[PDB]
Amino acid sequence: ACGYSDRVLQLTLGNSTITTQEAANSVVAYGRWPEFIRDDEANPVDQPTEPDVATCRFYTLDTVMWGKESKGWWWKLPDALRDMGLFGQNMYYHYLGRSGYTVHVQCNASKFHQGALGVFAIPEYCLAGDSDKQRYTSYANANPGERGGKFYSQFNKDNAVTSPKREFCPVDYLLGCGVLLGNAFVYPHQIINLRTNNSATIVLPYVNALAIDSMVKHNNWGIAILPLSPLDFAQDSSVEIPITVTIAPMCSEFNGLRNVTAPKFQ
Amino acid sequence: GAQVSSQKVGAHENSSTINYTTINYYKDSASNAASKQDYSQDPSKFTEPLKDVLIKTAPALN
Amino acid sequence: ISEV
Amino acid sequence: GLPVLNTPGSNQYLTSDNHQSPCAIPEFDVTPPIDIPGEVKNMMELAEIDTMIPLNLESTKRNTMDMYRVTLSDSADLSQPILCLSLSPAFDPRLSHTMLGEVLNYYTHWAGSLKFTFLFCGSMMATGKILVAYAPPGAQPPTSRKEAMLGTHVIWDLGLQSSCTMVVPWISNVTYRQTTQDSFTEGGYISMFYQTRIVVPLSTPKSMSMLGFVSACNDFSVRLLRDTTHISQSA
Amino acid sequence: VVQAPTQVPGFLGDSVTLPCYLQVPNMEVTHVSQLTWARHGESGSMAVFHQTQGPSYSESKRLEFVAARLGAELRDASLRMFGLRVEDEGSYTCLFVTFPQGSRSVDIWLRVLAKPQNTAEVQKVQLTGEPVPMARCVSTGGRPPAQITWHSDLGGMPQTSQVPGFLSGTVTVTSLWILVPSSQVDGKQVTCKVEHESFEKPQLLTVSLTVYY
Amino acid sequence: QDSLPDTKASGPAHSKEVPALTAVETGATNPLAPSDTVQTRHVVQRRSRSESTIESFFARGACVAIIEVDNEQPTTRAQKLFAMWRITYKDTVQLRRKLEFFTYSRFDMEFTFVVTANFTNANNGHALNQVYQIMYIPPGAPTPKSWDDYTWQTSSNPSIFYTYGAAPARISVPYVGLANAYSHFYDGFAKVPLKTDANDQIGDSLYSAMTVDDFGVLAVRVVNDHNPTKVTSKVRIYMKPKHVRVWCPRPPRAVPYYGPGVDYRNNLDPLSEKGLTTY
Numbered sequence A: 001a002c003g004y005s006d007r008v009l010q011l012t013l014g015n016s017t018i019t020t021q022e023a024a025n026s027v028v029a030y031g032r033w034p035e036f037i038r039d040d041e042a043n044p045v046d047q048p049t050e051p052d053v054a055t056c057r058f059y060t061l062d063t064v065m066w067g068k069e070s071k072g073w074w075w076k077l078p079d080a081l082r083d084m085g086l087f088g089q090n091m092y093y094h095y096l097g098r099s100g101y102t103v104h105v106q107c108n109a110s111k112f113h114q115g116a117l118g119v120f121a122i123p124e125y126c127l128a129g130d131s132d133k134q135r136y137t138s139y140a141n142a143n144p145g146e147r148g149g150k151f152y153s154q155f156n157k158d159n160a161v162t163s164p165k166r167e168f169c170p171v172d173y174l175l176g177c178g179v180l181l182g183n184a185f186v187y188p189h190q191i192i193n194l195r196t197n198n199s200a201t202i203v204l205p206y207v208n209a210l211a212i213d214s215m216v217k218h219n220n221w222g223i224a225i226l227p228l229s230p231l232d233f234a235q236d237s238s239v240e241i242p243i244t245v246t247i248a249p250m251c252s253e254f255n256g257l258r259n260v261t262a263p264k265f266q
Numbered sequence B: 001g002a003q004v005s006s007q008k009v010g011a012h013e014n015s016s017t018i019n020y021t022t023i024n025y026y027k028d029s030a031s032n033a034a035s036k037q038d039y040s041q042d043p044s045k046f047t048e049p050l051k052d053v054l055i056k057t058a059p060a061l062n
Numbered sequence C: 001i002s003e004v
Numbered sequence D: 001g002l003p004v005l006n007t008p009g010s011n012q013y014l015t016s017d018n019h020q021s022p023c024a025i026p027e028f029d030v031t032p033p034i035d036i037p038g039e040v041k042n043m044m045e046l047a048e049i050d051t052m053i054p055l056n057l058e059s060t061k062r063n064t065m066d067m068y069r070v071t072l073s074d075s076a077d078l079s080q081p082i083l084c085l086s087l088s089p090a091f092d093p094r095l096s097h098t099m100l101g102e103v104l105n106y107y108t109h110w111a112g113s114l115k116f117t118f119l120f121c122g123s124m125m126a127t128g129k130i131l132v133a134y135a136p137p138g139a140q141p142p143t144s145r146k147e148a149m150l151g152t153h154v155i156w157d158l159g160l161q162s163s164c165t166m167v168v169p170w171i172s173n174v175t176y177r178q179t180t181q182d183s184f185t186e187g188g189y190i191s192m193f194y195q196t197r198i199v200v201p202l203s204t205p206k207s208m209s210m211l212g213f214v215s216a217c218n219d220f221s222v223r224l225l226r227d228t229t230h231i232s233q234s235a
Numbered sequence E: 001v002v003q004a005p006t007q008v009p010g011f012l013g014d015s016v017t018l019p020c021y022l023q024v025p026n027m028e029v030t031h032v033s034q035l036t037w038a039r040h041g042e043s044g045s046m047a048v049f050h051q052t053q054g055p056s057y058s059e060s061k062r063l064e065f066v067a068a069r070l071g072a073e074l075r076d077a078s079l080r081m082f083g084l085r086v087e088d089e090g091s092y093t094c095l096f097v098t099f100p101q102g103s104r105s106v107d108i109w110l111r112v113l114a115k116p117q118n119t120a121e122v123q124k125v126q127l128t129g130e131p132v133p134m135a136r137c138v139s140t141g142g143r144p145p146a147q148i149t150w151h152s153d154l155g156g157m158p159q160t161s162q163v164p165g166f167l168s169g170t171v172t173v174t175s176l177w178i179l180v181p182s183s184q185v186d187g188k189q190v191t192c193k194v195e196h197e198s199f200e201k202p203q204l205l206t207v208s209l210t211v212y213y
Numbered sequence F: 001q002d003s004l005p006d007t008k009a010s011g012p013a014h015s016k017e018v019p020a021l022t023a024v025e026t027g028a029t030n031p032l033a034p035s036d037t038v039q040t041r042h043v044v045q046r047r048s049r050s051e052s053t054i055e056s057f058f059a060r061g062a063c064v065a066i067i068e069v070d071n072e073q074p075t076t077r078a079q080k081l082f083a084m085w086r087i088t089y090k091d092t093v094q095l096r097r098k099l100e101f102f103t104y105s106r107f108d109m110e111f112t113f114v115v116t117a118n119f120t121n122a123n124n125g126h127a128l129n130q131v132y133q134i135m136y137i138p139p140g141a142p143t144p145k146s147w148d149d150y151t152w153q154t155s156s157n158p159s160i161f162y163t164y165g166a167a168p169a170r171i172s173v174p175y176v177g178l179a180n181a182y183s184h185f186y187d188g189f190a191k192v193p194l195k196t197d198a199n200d201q202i203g204d205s206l207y208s209a210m211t212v213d214d215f216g217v218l219a220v221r222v223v224n225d226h227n228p229t230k231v232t233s234k235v236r237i238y239m240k241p242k243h244v245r246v247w248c249p250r251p252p253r254a255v256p257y258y259g260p261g262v263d264y265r266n267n268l269d270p271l272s273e274k275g276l277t278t279y
């Protein structure tokens, strides 16, 4: 009658609002909405900071382009937001930090384009390395920030055993970690199938084996976007359309304040 | 301290609730055997983790 | 004892 | 003949088991107890007593009475730290042999808050203000007062109350840390800097010792009993 | 198996390395392969080189760790202690950890100190009889005193008195001088042999004489 | 009462309720039952899922280690008069793969030890029955440097003294994790390189590893002094998780394991060939 649809949503957090008119409902991972540490689950004893609206708001990462030969993209959280406004500052000034997230992936095209993206949110997304040496990807390479990384179609082993790259080599049909991509659907996910929807919204609780941890040392969630069905349009052979990822911290609390961490990335 | 529970009987002799008895002999619960009387749950958190869960007879996209 |  | 069936484990000897065994001297007339002062019920009671920290393990000082003395003076370089120490209470060489460090070295894991108390042993005419700080791990270890004051800290004013306590609050990711050194369970940094300087009048010593003490707070516990590396025996 | 060669002098000043080699047989290769060093040492219970993934400095600020770490090798690791004071011995140990049997190794230790320096000076004028011409064999800077030995060419040697040790900064100093009496020639290869057993062959310093009028 | 739901009888349909159509884009699985798309009869269902509970899926001792230890004259060379094993489930593959259907777990652990021995030399007399000491050395405790040094006094570490030929030894251990659950996967590092670090080695650590020593080691020795003939033994260790809870399911490992992380190397082609239209 007045017209509410699970295809049209507005998300408002802090000073930021997102609208979509072609959603496919939204996922709350494992059925758990984010929340703060309860006193009976608390572990550091100092009073936490809870920046609230200053950090729990939508940050848009740099857009990536989906073309016919794209194999996929991945980001880790909190890493993709390490340089985002006051979320990054609080993350680096405190030994411990905890946060849930709303992830909104945006990709519009037209009624004559086709393709389907799988958007998966993976707890502890360990990725495989590029060489004979095990567990050797370096901190700077494992953590690309908002730039994220990419998937490949095959294992290209780094051979310069002299000046090893120490990078991940995520093969796409193996989900970058030795399992088959088809089973990634056991993880919280949505599909952006261009004939049906133009966005995916997934709410992520904080998941870890601890109530709070070091955000600088450990990524809690990985976001993997892979073309389940490749992009195609009319009869053109080089169609490209943007994919934009907007993520908002939720229920952020931090403990253990001191001087700022300055990681060496370069 | 004997716990008495019912067995779920498979093959029946040509002879009812058959029971078995358990006593824990150690103070540390890690020493205990497994009771294997385990409850289950709903798969929904994995099969339907949607903010608006819709009924299967209705359209998924309205 | 305790039957269950 | 009660029918019995022997399970795995039969006839083993586990040195941490807890079983009954026949008494070799039956009906012995045991001497009854008397009330001796000083009974202890838990090893953590000993970790709660302040014991003096060997803070100065420089070459010529370690293993002498001088390992317990840190020199303060009115001409010290005010920009430099007075002392620096890692929060590894069973492993850092300044903390591992205190009563707190000796008890933790019989356990694999520790958790809780700790308190450092410092005693000024200058004359009554000496004054000064000192900043003592704790930086939870993960950033550069403080090299200046400017960095140290951004973490947990106490500014001590010297005066009639001779001593000052800084509490290092339990701030940890894991629920228990390891007593060996491990970066995964590292505890952070303690540093101390002059806030103003030691000032004395004429005819007064310009240098003096400071002594430091450490003990566990009431939320501290240890678990997983293990042998210590602090005693051995040769063949 | 454990095959550590480290019984090292060890030179002071400093500085030198404190190595640890564990050559690995050979068809049952070793992991996890973390390496621990325990001093000997008021060990309660740390002055430790431990290396899990990233090399961890258990607090003795004056340390250098050089092994192909954060990856693996495994361990024929080298340590270094500078510096530069005689933080001596005592002793040091080198213990490894292993998935097979090898959460174990061997204690292995040695020396440190201290080499001296030498020069020769010869004067003054001969008004006899019948002492000095005079050759002096100065020996500066060596706590374990260097055995200075004056010899020459003839039986005019039995005459060799010593300045004992009035020690400089931690380090002992001496001067042997001769005397050798009287009279004329230049002219002989009178050689002072200063030892200490460090460096190469003992410090052999040959000189002349002050002949006057 | 643990049986699965009964099938309801259902008949024809001609309606606007369309359970057969759905949109998997939402992230949900369509909860259909056969009576949504065909006519069914009533069936009183008696099957149960008793054997696929988390406890029953893990309720088996699985081999995780084979430790070899000898009893012979102490020579000067490298021998195996005692052996050390770093405790792990990643030296074998079968239990590793079942645990890794999940990201986190919490359980007590039962260890059963099977010990076998044999002669190696045709004959230098015989051997009297051997007793084995299996000592647990937690991270930080002193490790033995020889088979009879002082660490074997075991005043605080727990040891099992097992007699050859007795029933396999068995002990239980509580949940001993430092966190509230064991992490089967850790996307992170134990150290972070900082800009002010003196060199790059200082902040370098292995990807996805946590503590260095993890749970410590088991040190095994034969307590007997040597006989003239050499005797070799193997201790096989079987782990069984009990009182098990698990969280966050994962795809199972599909290509061979290559080390303790998730790295892969060969046989990256798990699926065989089959024609699209071949039954």
Ligand SMILES: CCCCCCCCCCCCC/C=C/[C@@H](O)[C@H](N)CO
Residues within 6 Å of the ligand: F087, F089, F109, F111, F134, F135, F136, F158, F159, F160, F171, F173, F176, F177, F181, F182, F183, F184, F215
């Ligand atoms: C006398 C024999 C005593 C044996 C004592 C063994 C103690 C250790 C039990 C460990 C059970 C390990 C299960 C695995 C946990 C790992 O997944 C994770 N890395 C922990 O975060």
Ligand SMILES: *C(=O)CCCCCCCCCCCCC
Residues within 6 Å of the ligand: B001, B002, B023, B024, B025, C001
């Ligand atoms: C509940 O336990 C009531 C009493 C049960 C009586 C039978 C006990 C059998 C022996 C148990 C011994 C445990 C180890 C001392």
